[PDB]
Symmetry: C2
Subunit: 319 residues, 2 copies
Amino acid sequence: NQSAIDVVAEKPSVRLTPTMMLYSGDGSHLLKSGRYLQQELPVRIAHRIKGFRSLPFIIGCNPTILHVHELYIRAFQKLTDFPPIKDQADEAQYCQLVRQLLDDHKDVVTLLAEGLRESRKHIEDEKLVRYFLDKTLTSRLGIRMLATHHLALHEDKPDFVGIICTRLSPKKIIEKWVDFARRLCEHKYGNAPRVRINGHVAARFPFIPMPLDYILPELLKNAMRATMESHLDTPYNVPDVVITIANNDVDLIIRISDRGGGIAHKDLDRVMDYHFTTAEFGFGLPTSRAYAEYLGGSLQLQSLQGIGTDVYLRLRHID
Amino acid sequence: NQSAIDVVAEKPSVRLTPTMMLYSGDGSHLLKSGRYLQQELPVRIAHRIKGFRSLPFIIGCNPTILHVHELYIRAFQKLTDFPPIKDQADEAQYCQLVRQLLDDHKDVVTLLAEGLRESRKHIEDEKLVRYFLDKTLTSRLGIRMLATHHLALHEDKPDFVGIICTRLSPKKIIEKWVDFARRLCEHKYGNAPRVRINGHVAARFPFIPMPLDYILPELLKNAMRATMESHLDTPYNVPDVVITIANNDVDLIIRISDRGGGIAHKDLDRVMDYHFTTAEFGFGLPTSRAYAEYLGGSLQLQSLQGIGTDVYLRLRHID
Ligand SMILES: Nc1ncnc2c1ncn2[C@@H]1O[C@H](COP(=O)(O)OP(=O)(O)O)[C@@H](O)[C@H]1O
Ligand SMILES: Nc1ncnc2c1ncn2[C@@H]1O[C@H](COP(=O)(O)OP(=O)(O)O)[C@@H](O)[C@H]1O
Ligand SMILES: O=C(O)c1sc2cc(F)sc2c1Cl
Ligand SMILES: O=C(O)c1sc2cc(F)sc2c1Cl
Ligand SMILES: O=C(O)c1sc2cc(F)sc2c1Cl
Ligand SMILES: O=C(O)c1sc2cc(F)sc2c1Cl
Ligand SMILES: O=C(O)c1sc2cc(F)sc2c1Cl
Ligand SMILES: O=C(O)c1sc2cc(F)sc2c1Cl
């Protein structure tokens, strides 16, 4: 066992405010920020190692689960071996290790789902598995936003302070993912539902697109697939998917309404479980919910069995 | 104190199934049903007397609350003094007392809200008050359906077995209350939102209209009022209220969508409390929710602050 990991496995995380990210974004400010990252990332990694150590032995023993645990141990070793950042050249050296770790851990979610799939015969508690996956994936999301934000601060990209867009239009980010989903849908069925966008279509505000880039294609794929499966007898005459944007001082709400038949009563208690899918890998819906909650929001579903489903994505604002 | 009340205050209620109501509905069947009512009503009344006896003393002491408690004691005395139903003439005698008690207790909800309003300075628990009102009003709803159903069984009214409509159209019962709400709305503002009805508009099925006759005008008044208050600057150009009917083997779902600005974040935790209203008596929403839950369903709200509100009324089917 590694005693260095034990030293910070229970140290509370120091949270960088999404408002503080705008406040610091530069040369001398990049150094203070890089010093923060250097000290904070091993703590976040150690909290994840603690999670793998706390798994029931028969699950933690899985070679795929063990491989992810060992990747986290490797990441902690590499981040802690690095000398302190005294100057901007030291700050730059560190950035290249962060880029390497961002790519080395690209498939962690895939590996975890694989390991847990192979260990399904030893899982008697979906609430324990939900806790492990919600905690692991949201904390990994937090590590990724910190890492990507710091790297992006080195660019003079328009309307962006790192990963924060200063003038994010929800209508534009929704339109981008609607085009992507309609193309995949059209390839599979020969047609895709037309998507209408209404509400506060002219809203623009400081926002981090990363969560929306994950959640939006997941909800659009679900609404479009349910609409096509529900109308196989009339595939070229399908009802529209309606998206409403509601923007207020507190949060952004995105409502996605489909006429895809609804989520059956028997399936409604399982649609938010990991691995659960009625398609022919069940991670889109529980991961989107855990991400929205991690960011101060929520993901709620309202089923109208025989008609369709309304999905409400609520995300707390920057300020 | 009355010892007869004590004898049945904890006796469990025997539930008449909404399916059993169709199964019995006649002369000899009316007698067995009237015998059931005679024995069941004092038990339901005694459960309510127990509720008034269990209120904190400072609240139960209120003369308005005491007047309702004393009305229930009177109803128990009158129902128990009546001799057993040996024949159809005895069954008919009992019906006339039930009619009198139905009218004598017409305003019980009004009296209870008044008594609790005068005792607000001594209420430190909205969860206790919610429990008392949810239990009292839903059990009173149950007493009223039993009483009205038995009386209605004496009629040869088309498409009705007592209070059960054998071919209830949700679109027709919604249209009836839309006309009522639009007229009241037009009187107050000079205009009312146009109501569109979609989904399963041709659905017809066995159903008891009584719950819908209470809940529908409450949700329509709220959706229409919020729409008019939200558009005072353009009172003759207001967005439509959209109602969707979803009918499946398990339940009927009625979605009411408005563009009335939404329910504010500060008010969202209080809209389901009794007495809470932002209008210039806050019972419509908590009573509708308690009624829908009492009948195996639910009443759920989804707020899009800055845009509008979606209300979902779910009611379990007869079978
Ligand atoms: N809009 C919707 N309409 C109908 N069914 C839906 C909808 N959204 C989700 N579902 C159901 O929830 C299930 C779980 O979805 P999810 O967890 O996102 O994973 P996956 O996309 O792999 O199926 C889906 O397989 C589908 O049965
Ligand atoms: N559709 C809606 N749009 C906006 N506000 C609503 C809506 N439905 C309910 N509300 C809010 O909830 C409050 C409580 O409603 P309710 O309990 O039905 O009582 P009341 O009709 O006496 O106000 C309302 O006063 C209003 O502020
Ligand atoms: O992140 C954490 O703090 C923890 S504690 C714990 C216990 C488990 F069984 S999984 C798990 C995780 Cl993921
Ligand atoms: O699990 C991940 O996705 C990542 S990305 C990244 C960048 C770092 F600097 S550590 C680290 C980890 Cl642990
Ligand atoms: O039917 C399917 O299986 C799929 S997968 C997918 C991904 C998208 F973005 S849309 C879409 C559809 Cl419609
Ligand atoms: O119906 C009941 O069984 C009861 S028990 C109880 C305790 C209270 F404080 S009110 C109340 C009611 Cl309404
Ligand atoms: O509270 C009420 O609304 C009613 S109506 C009715 C009819 C009866 F026969 S008893 C009784 C009561 Cl207790
Ligand atoms: O604005 C109001 O106060 C009211 S009260 C009422 C009752 C109805 F049925 S509609 C309606 C409206 Cl719109």
